[PDB]
Amino acid sequence: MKFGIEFVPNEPIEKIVKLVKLAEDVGFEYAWITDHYNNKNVYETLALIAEGTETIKLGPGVTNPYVRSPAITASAIATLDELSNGRATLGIGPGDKATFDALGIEWVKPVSTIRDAIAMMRTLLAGEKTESGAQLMGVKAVQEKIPIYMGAQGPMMLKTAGEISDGALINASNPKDFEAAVPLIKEGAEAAGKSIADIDVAAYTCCSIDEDAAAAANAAKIVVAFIAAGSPPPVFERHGLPADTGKKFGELLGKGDFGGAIGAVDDALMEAFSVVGTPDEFIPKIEALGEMGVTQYVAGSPIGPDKEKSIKLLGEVIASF
Amino acid sequence: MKFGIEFVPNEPIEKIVKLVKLAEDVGFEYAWITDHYNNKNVYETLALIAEGTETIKLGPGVTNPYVRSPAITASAIATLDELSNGRATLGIGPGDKATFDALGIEWVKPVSTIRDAIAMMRTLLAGEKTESGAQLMGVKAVQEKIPIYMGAQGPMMLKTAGEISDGALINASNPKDFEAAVPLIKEGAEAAGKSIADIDVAAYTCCSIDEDAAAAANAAKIVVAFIAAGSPPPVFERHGLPADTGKKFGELLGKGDFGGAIGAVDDALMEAFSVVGTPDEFIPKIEALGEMGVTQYVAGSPIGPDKEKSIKLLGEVIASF
Amino acid sequence: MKFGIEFVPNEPIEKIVKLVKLAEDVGFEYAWITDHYNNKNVYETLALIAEGTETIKLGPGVTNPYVRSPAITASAIATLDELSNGRATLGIGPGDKATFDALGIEWVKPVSTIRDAIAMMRTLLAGEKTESGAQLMGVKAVQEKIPIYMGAQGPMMLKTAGEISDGALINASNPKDFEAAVPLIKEGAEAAGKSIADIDVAAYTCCSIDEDAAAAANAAKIVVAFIAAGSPPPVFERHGLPADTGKKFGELLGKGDFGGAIGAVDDALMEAFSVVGTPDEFIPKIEALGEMGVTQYVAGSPIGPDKEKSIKLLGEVIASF
Amino acid sequence: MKFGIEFVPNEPIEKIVKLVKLAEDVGFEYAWITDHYNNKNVYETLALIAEGTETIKLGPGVTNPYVRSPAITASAIATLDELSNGRATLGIGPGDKATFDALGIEWVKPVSTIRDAIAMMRTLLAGEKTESGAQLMGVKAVQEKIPIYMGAQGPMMLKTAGEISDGALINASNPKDFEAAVPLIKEGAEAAGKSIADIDVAAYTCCSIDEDAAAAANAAKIVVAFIAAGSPPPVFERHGLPADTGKKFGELLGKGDFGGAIGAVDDALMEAFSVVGTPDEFIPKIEALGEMGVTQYVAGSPIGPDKEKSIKLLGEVIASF
Ligand SMILES: [Cl-]
Ligand SMILES: [Cl-]
């Protein structure tokens, strides 16, 4: 089991740099920085992180092919690869409708757009020239092949991730989810003459760890609420939950009733959409994920009540693997 | 007269950082970094430059509204403003069809596209929400109003710059060009109820300074050949140069005959398209630019035979103003 | 040689805007819209064209001092200049007795009227106050000097154009016409202390371009028929055509026998009153006009069998200049 | 009771378009744009407004028969009618001596001049040919009969408005004014075999609405000053005001002492020449106007301290009707 950790560039970058270095120091192998126009620039963040670290792999988790030309993305990743001396990773996903409407961007066929974006980035990152004539000149990747992970939350994306990516960042925290997802990724990989062993199945989980299991659960509630809000009914179906649970949280979060949403979050939901608790509790859960194909466990927001402490606690978990 | 300097991110960023720091040490107030998908990401470069400097203003010179959503650009710029404690600048221009063809981007209505991008960025950078509902959350500009400069090489762009920008980055090095351009910026400024005094007129010059005039001239020739090749007929007429000049250089460069191009660059062309020579020779030329309305002298490529050495020589020049 | 294009606002304004946009895209620098009380309002048309274009100059071609107070004309042009960001032009001619009889307007001293009109508009557009006390208040020109072109089809108008205008819109398509007309403009320019080089001599031609020279010629026949019907004796004399040619076509047209008029149009007439043929044929004819002092070639009605196609063909022609 | 709103084209047209769209969204059914040579062209303004709206009726309020030939006005209205798909209206008045003096136009027989102008325009707008031969050809009205409103501030104009118009735009804000005016309109309509029910009696009021009744009153004072300054003796007598009132303000404004004129405006004047206050206060006032025959309430300048806000407030008032 490999470990990754997520950070949202909504706090001072100098602070994020220190936290990533801490994560590196306790054993995390991957650092994933979210990419959203309303937060700090993901590449300016990653660049400063690269300077403050030495071995952890880092990249956007995930960017998308719409807010920036895939060529600009390839260039930003190659630039990061040079700064980090070969530690860049590239996570890319379809993005979200809310964002694109606010940016006046047409959200046309995400799968094929991602497919085309990756094809172009593969070419550019390889130092090659695309049929259209695009080619990197003043920047060059260090790695022979920078890994490209696809954020995949649906069947077509999962199959596609198997076919063209090196990893899948799946927004899920429970074994049952990967029991359903991995097979799709495998089907895609085989179709491409690849093996499921070639794809790093990353569990992009809602993570909250603390000595106080109660405090841990409380810091994750708001995150789990949005997760539920954004999940299709067949997902609540999979976890033995009410098919309309998501809609419920949708309305609360919609109004802006965060307090009510938090209060609506019970144990059945925490169990379905997050990995929360004490260090000891994380172990069997991560093992269960591993048994379902997860090869990378990503500690996602909120990480814990106190990030610095929680990363230290996660270090204990990593030492157990 | 204020001073700016250009750097192309096609060499190690650590080196660029050292060069901007040096430019800062000798009196430059602005650092302009080029932005092209085929070179290193301009924001990763700018972020590091900010970390390695303390008072110099810095920003892309220039980015464009097509390769990245202007909302991403605003975010990149606000992130830089935070990292730099309010020293960011934002230069933006139309871009070039060649690049966009390679990237599969349609180059629609450049003037209105830039005007719309700027309106959106003004709002986002001000911390406000756009009509479309876009708003910066995890990042906030330090400056109340981050300066936006427009690259303007035509009448419509110059008037627009006077109307909606805080400055115009004009690729011209001779007084006669500004004698013709400033009036248009002034028409725009006045149409917007502003004053020509509210616009920083920046001569984005081809600069080549060296103790050895001949060495300086030689280093700039290839740049002058490209400048001439991309110059519209009115520019030549204005300088008393054959109307065909641009097409001649265009063909010479197009067939890879760089020797011919360089050989065709004479005293007349150097005089019209660059500021080259010894420190003592720079003084009068820059004063002449100031008398035609230029408020910021930008030393652009190649800067000189040796950048580090030339930055120090420009330091002498700056001390003379 | 600069290129202009003429459109009659008797078809959807929406279509006209797109065609002007197309013209702008292929290189035309001027758009001229006719102004007749019986067609769509020229300014509503120009205002929408301004919204749908970016760089092409646009203006009425031509209006007159009788159907609207020159002050109203000044305001309409200044309004257009604001909307177009400094791209307005003002073509104004004496008008014609037919129209003014149908409108109950006394065609009093046309030369003095157009002269006094222009003086008033010059003052108003400059934002100054006339002796009579008129002054623009809620509208202001962007350009420091909006160009005023005079429709000049006779000696006194040509001399006056040279004396007080920035250009002359001459309804002629053959070099012999300008051979005779330019000297008159020159006389006026010199009488005013100006030079013929200060006046844009625009050939307001009957243009019809197409791959098929036969089809091109056929589309212009009806237009030529009318031009002939309205041409004075020295014109037919100049082109070695029967002195009664006008009266002839005048009767065929005055009886709705358009089929007859068209059939009565031969090569000698096509040669004397229009520029028709394939793109290859246009080049020499346009250069021939330029040799006679024409500085702006205006492609006038019908433009071609298919306006859209023809504008594209004229684009090829423009690329040759 | 129907609602109209007035805008003066002395601010960017794009802004006016949005304000009219807002007005349309909150229920206004008519938009009136003033027409003076010293402000932006009314038809270019109306054309862009038509583009940015869908149901509100729009037209000049009011134009006159002196600055443009009635035939030009007819085609301008017909053009607007096509652009808005049958939403054009036509307001016409006699104009003012001071304006025509400045334009060197002979202000003769206003009553018959308007009468003749309307007859001509009804013929042209109907697509028919005048006795003089004038006829629209390249433009055609959409509405079977475009409404023509006469600005009527006196007995003859009111009578005439009843006889030949479809509505009267009366510059008055108090019920007492319409008590005196409507009967004159009725007399004129009956004389023409028409019904007072056929004439839209529009109160072209000085309007100022705001949450703060004081702020509202303050924004309207300067407007009221001019109204009083231009009011005939019978009006002052009607509102128990000094016969000197008019000439007293006329003198102050003539001195350029607007601060004084404003300070001279008391509640008595506000009450006689405007509709100011909070939304709740407008309802009874508009009801009172309705009882006197007013069929359209026009919110004229200043509309309120902040137009956008005030339009929203008027939206509430409209909601009550
Ligand atoms: Cl970026
Ligand atoms: Cl008009």
From Swiss-Prot, chains A, B, C, D:
UniProt pH dependence: Optimum pH is 7.0.
Keyword Membrane: no
SUPFAM superfamilies with a match to the protein in the record: Bacterial luciferase-like
Keywords linked to the UniProt accession: Cytoplasm, Methanogenesis, One-carbon metabolism, Oxidoreductase
Pathway(s) served: One-carbon metabolism; methanogenesis from CO(2); methyl-coenzyme M from 5,10-methylene-5,6,7,8-tetrahydromethanopterin: step 1/2
GO biological process: methanogenesis, from carbon dioxide; one-carbon metabolic process
The reaction(s) this protein catalyses: 5-methyl-5,6,7,8-tetrahydromethanopterin + oxidized coenzyme F420-(gamma-L-Glu)(n) + H(+) = 5,10-methylenetetrahydromethanopterin + reduced coenzyme F420-(gamma-L-Glu)(n)
Lineage: superkingdom: Archaea
HAMAP family linked to this entry: F420_mer
UniProt protein name: 5,10-methylenetetrahydromethanopterin reductase
Organism: Methanothermobacter marburgensis (strain ATCC BAA-927 / DSM 2133 / JCM 14651 / NBRC 100331 / OCM 82 / Marburg) (Methanobacterium thermoautotrophicum)
Gene name of this polypeptide: mer
